Design a protein around this ligand. Sequence first.
Ligand SMILES: O=C(O)c1c(Cl)cccc1Oc1ccc(F)cc1
Length: 164
Amino acid sequence: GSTSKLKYVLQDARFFLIKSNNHENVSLAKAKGVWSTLPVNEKKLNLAFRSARSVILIFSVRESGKFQGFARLSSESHHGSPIHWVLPAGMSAKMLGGVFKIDWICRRELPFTKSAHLTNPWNEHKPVKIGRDGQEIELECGTQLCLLFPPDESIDLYQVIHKM
Ligand SMILES: O=C(O)c1c(Cl)cccc1Oc1ccc(F)cc1
């Protein structure tokens, strides 16, 4: 299977590692195509969205040993139908910023064992699995990381390719 469409989507991308707190919220985000974060990281992502042809979120639930997929921002965050996230301990829906609409590019998992050869120059050349929530990943490392994920037959890139 050709990777030309995915390489096109990634040509001028920025990449951010999302260290999700709860697997259930990743499931919600996957199903509904929406995501939200704290205003600190939100502002950084809204700026990125204006700065690059694609902004890619690469999800890795904390302590999971895996990435759970990756998605492209379709919009800057907006404030809308409320999403009922599973709120982690000591968190409240008030702490969250607006909602990003996101188009999932892959919803299949990638174990850290499969990315162990990739290092992120923008995180001190550490293996790319290592990073805080919102860690930016350099273009080539991010591109290669996305290309390691298995093909996802539930995904059709047509809508993304049209939004571009
Ligand atoms: O990381 C998640 O589980 C998560 C996701 Cl995927 C989407 C939306 C919210 C999430 O959790 C939070 C809930 C409230 C907060 F104030 C901060 C994070």
